[PDB]
Design a protein around this ligand. Structure first.
Ligand SMILES: O=P(O)(O)OC[C@H]1O[C@H](O)[C@H](O)[C@@H](O)[C@@H]1O
Ligand SMILES: O=P(O)(O)OC[C@H]1O[C@H](O)[C@H](O)[C@@H](O)[C@@H]1O
Lengths: 602, 127, 603
């Protein structure tokens, strides 16, 4: 309300390291009008990041120029710029060149103030604290040199900026404080290390488990920041439950991350981009299985699962045993429906697999041998239509063309079952996905109604096998199944829902909890939500199959309606809707720190 | 006639691709083409109508362009006199092009140096 | 109702393919093929040309039907019972109109002691209609006689050509319920142009005088009498119902609007996919017809569509031409980038195509030739550059040869003269009502003009040198289909438009426009603009049309798509599924009125 200058503090600002970068990428537009030009982004300085993202500019206000000049003084570095990303974000890039002065003197101060020590072994630990003092310096100077300074909000993202949170309030600078944890630090190691992490979220000895992993300095850094914040904020309501029972600070507001959504001129252009991308997947599955194309591709479905290669976290284990049962239900029942599940999770690869790479080259061979004799037919028809005669149709193709086509069919034929992995792996037997595939019994056989393709790399437009982008490949697949146990927010299930493609999310996922909260209808709107908190592994697998078989039994027309319904939920995941929550958080903090000038509006 | 030639090239490209797509899903399936079902009733009606539009009763023209003085033109006057109206019975068809060949031409898009090389014989009686 | 009853659909257009009634009867077959099942039959004229295409002969299922067919065939009359090959498998009783040996004079003398209507020998179909009339009454008569305890029969009569055989059934007093469905008022057609303000003077028109002045009295008398000798009188349109109330002198009991069997695509947006595909093929035409004069953004261009028989006053081309002349002003005096390319697809007498509409297509092709040459040459130089490992230089991709090729293409694709209005050459160019108006209003397809009028004097065909696309596809390509009319009993040209996703400007005088006013409350909101032409002058109607056209012109890309999706929803209204519920009321209304005890009143 009252004019004020706020700062968004994160490590991922002009770094491009984590997913927090992608959050603040498109957050800049919606926050660029709510506080206007007054808002800033405090971030670390990298010379690599400047050449790409940062364009340096002078200070508009004379107080800011004094603050930047003073920041240059005392062996500290500032590089005020403007981020080249859309929104016009004015960025305050602080270098680690101030390592000589801030780290040694203020580590003792941090000890006399926060009582948190930093091990020298951990690299980003010493780098985070430096960045922490540098932020407090800039905020401190901004409050001091600006006469009658408006209420300040310091918006802190991730553990790396969590240290500078307690310092901004340690110096008692008149500043309202927000901490937005996009992922709980201790929650990541607790997810796999401790069984039933969600079930035992209350039980977990909060100090013991952090110390067993030698991450205590980091948990202590993430906490304290929580306690030394008026408004504590989580992206997910499931992460809010995490913070309530582990970080021990209940999130004041839940501000879910948002995606800028591409608005097309036609509201059905996503469905036009569906058929175009489906055909490019059709060129792949026609090629990968050659001589084994005894399945109707007109009535075939594509299931999609992506993310970092985490077998338990990105819930590949749930989805693999579910397709094994979907193998049964589509085979014991007289069904023509074939499902081609794609596993796009990048891992260590030597090179491309021989038979897959051959299959694509024989695919074009059976396109070349179907273009040569096609042109023969084309000329014979053009010279028959010009004469004035309908093609005989039994003399259009010569004996040579039948020998060409007869040899094309002889080359294509294979006996070996089509491969499961698109690439060749260094550790094939040790690979958790490939080990499960051979266990469940899906070798991409003729009898199998589900054929598993594991592309052990990110997709690229410049690829020998599958030359399509990630964004395009999602739009091609019919359904995007994302079972999860530990996703703070689903950046992959949600990018799916931003597009017209329906996504099977889960209750433990941040996206799935958001869809349960906002909209009342789960399956009706398209987004299937899997109960994984109050259910066993086996029930969760079976619920996936009832969800998968529901989509399998769906008709052509009903699939299109559901894909149109999922398009309507893009507005819900737009920064336009999901940035309202952050705006409330900023307003809520000002009220907590300084009540008289700013109305709380609670 | 030039537009019809491209029309009978377009109607011979549409059903060619329809032949090609049905063949490619026949070669991939593992079966040589049937060769009789390859073209549907939709394709046959396209080709049957294309032929019906092609049909002309007028004999193809002696001069490619339209002249200001057609009757006064010494070449065209001789053609109608000798009796070569580009008929089916005629074994010689005379095709006068009243203007220089060009590559930027709606009809006959070939330049003079290329057009000479295309023709089998270059007859030049002179006085 | 629909229990223990038989319906005979009697029309001249049954297995003939002459008029629009053929399409109505053909399409109605499927919805009527389950309401009365296999029991319904269609009585029609017999043509050996029509049999080879449409009729497959079959034996009689019921033994009584064999008796009826044999007795009529034996008693100096000709019948060819069979099944129509159109969808719904209608069973057709093709009666030979060629068998005129004795009925022509003896039966006409019987017609005069009964109906007191005489037939002139000069009029061909007049003598053929009455023959077909007696033959129907014979078949119905035998069917009632030889079938012991016969279910009540509903004789469903379409057009004046069957209208004579209507009164015979009542004259014999055979137990038969009777329906007459006039798809177009006979006397209304000549009154439309001959008498000024036909709709305004519909009550005033001297009903017997005007019929005699044009020597159609035998047929007006034939169409009337059929009306009076029918329990249920039925009109296709509510505007035709007003016509019949003051011309045929019968208020139509029900209005059963004609319907189209809509093509439903697996995707509910496939019409809009077929929009862009067909728009591009129109874009290829607009790039050709206008060459060297292409200074108009084609992304922001609209296509207006008008079709039908070549009737300048009836199909309301006069209204639409003076309206584009004002739309020329409103899009030019206001700083607008919007260009509108109106297409007039009304077939007329043509000699051949036009030099500059076929040369423009040829230069469009040369500029696709001299682009494809310098693109493959670009492509080959690019392919050998990416393999070496270098991004294309972009100043050295194209050589000096390519610049000379492209520079000469640009020189050839230059014209001083403005693009042609018509896309063919006419026999009577000056006498042509459309072309005369175009030169009068001042739209010569100029650079300054924001509306360019193209009149394709012939029907669209896939096999065409200039514009190779079907009629069905061309409608789907155009943004808006404007159909002003004065006398369209039921507009199928605007009707088929609304079946597709394309919005259509109908009128109050049209049968389709009156239907859209009656059923749905929202006119312009649902897409179908309705023009007031009954209570307004010519000039006001042109201006109402201008405000309707300018409303579509000021519409954005996105708002156009929404309206086209809304017009798709109105296809269900024009489906025989929604429009055949009206014929069912007419049949139900008849069984009851003719035979009250057996069939419920159904009011
Ligand atoms: O994805 P499916 O349910 O197989 O449906 C396939 C359909 O996808 C899109 O909607 C396209 O626009 C249609 O042309 C296609 O028929
Ligand atoms: O017809 P317009 O309003 O110019 O819109 C043009 C649009 O038509 C359809 O909806 C197509 O699917 C779109 O690809 C295209 O953008």
């Amino acid at each position: 309300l009252e004019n004020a200058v706020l700062f968004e503090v994160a490590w991922e600002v002009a770094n491009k390291v984590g997913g927090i970068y992608t959050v603040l990428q498109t957050k800049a537009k919606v926050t660029g009008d709510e506080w206007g030009d007054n808002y800033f982004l405090v971030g670390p300085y990298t010379e690599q990041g400047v050449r790409t993202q940062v364009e340096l500019l002078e200070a508009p206000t004379p107080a800011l120029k004094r603050t930047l000049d003073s920041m240059n003084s005392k062996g500290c570095k500032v590089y005020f710029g403007r981020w080249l990303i859309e929104g016009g974000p004015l960025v305050v890039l602080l270098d680690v060149g101030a390592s000589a002065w801030a780290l040694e003197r203020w580590k003792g101060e941090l000890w006399d103030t926060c009582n948190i020590g930093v091990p020298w072994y951990d690299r980003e630990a010493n780098d985070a604290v430096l960045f922490g003092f540098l932020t407090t310096w800039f905020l401190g100077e901004f409050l001091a040199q600006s006469e009658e300074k408006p209420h300040v909000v310091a918006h802190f993202h991730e553990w790396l900026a969590g240290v500078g949170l307690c310092l901004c309030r340690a110096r008692r600078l008149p500043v309202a404080t927000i901490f937005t944890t996009h992922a709980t630090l201790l929650g990541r190691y607790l997810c796999a290390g401790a069984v039933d992490f969600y079930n035992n979220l209350e039980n977990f000895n909060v100090d013991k488990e952090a110390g067993e992993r030698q991450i205590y300095h980091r948990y202590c850094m993430e906490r304290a920041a929580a306690h030394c914040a008026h408004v504590f904020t989580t992206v997910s309501q499931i992460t809010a439950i995490e913070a309530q029972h582990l970080l021990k600070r209940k999130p004041d507001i839940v501000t879910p991350n948002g995606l800028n959504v591409k608005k097309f001129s036609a509201m059905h252009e996503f469905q036009n981009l569906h058929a175009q991308s489906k055909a490019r997947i059709q060129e792949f599955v026609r090629g990968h299985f050659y001589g084994h194309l005894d399945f109707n591709l007109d009535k075939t479905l594509y299931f999609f699962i992506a993310g970092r290669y985490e077998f338990s976290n990105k819930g590949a284990d749930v989805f693999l045993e579910a397709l094994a049962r979907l193998n049964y239900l589509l085979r014991v029942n007289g069904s023509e429906q074939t499902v081609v599940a794609f596993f796009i999770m990048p891992a260590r690869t030597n090179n491309f697999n021989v038979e897959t790479l051959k299959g694509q080259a024989v695919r074009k061979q059976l396109w070349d041998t179907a273009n040569t004799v096609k042109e023969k037919f084309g000329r014979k028809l053009y010279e028959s239509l010009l004469v004035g005669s309908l093609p005989d149709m039994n003399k259009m193709l010569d004996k040579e063309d039948f020998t060409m086509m007869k040899r094309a069919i002889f080359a294509t034929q294979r006996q070996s079952f089509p491969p499961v992995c698109t690439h060749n792996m260094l550790d094939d037997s040790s690979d958790p996905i490939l080990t499960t595939i051979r266990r469940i019994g899906l070798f991409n056989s003729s009898a199998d109604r589900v054929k598993v393709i594991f592309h052990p790399e990110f997709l690229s437009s410049t690829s020998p096998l599958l030359p399509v982008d990630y964004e395009e490949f999602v739009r091609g697949c019919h359904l995007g199944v994302f079972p999860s146990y530990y996703e703070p927010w689903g950046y992959t299930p949600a990018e799916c829902t931003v597009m017209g493609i329906p996504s099977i999310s889960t209750n433990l996922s941040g996206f799935g909890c958001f869809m349960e909260e906002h909209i009342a209808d789960p399956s009706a709107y398209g987004i299937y939500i899997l109960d994984r908190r109050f259910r066993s592994l086996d029930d969760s697998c079976s619920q996936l199959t009832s969800f998968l078989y529901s989509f399998c039994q769906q008709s052509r027309r009903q699939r299109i309606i559901q894909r149109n319904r999922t398009e309507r939920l893009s507005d819900l995941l737009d920064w336009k809707y999901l940035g309202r929550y952050y705006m409330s958080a900023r307003h809520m903090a000002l009220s907590k720190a300084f009540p008289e000038h700013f109305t709380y509006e609670p």
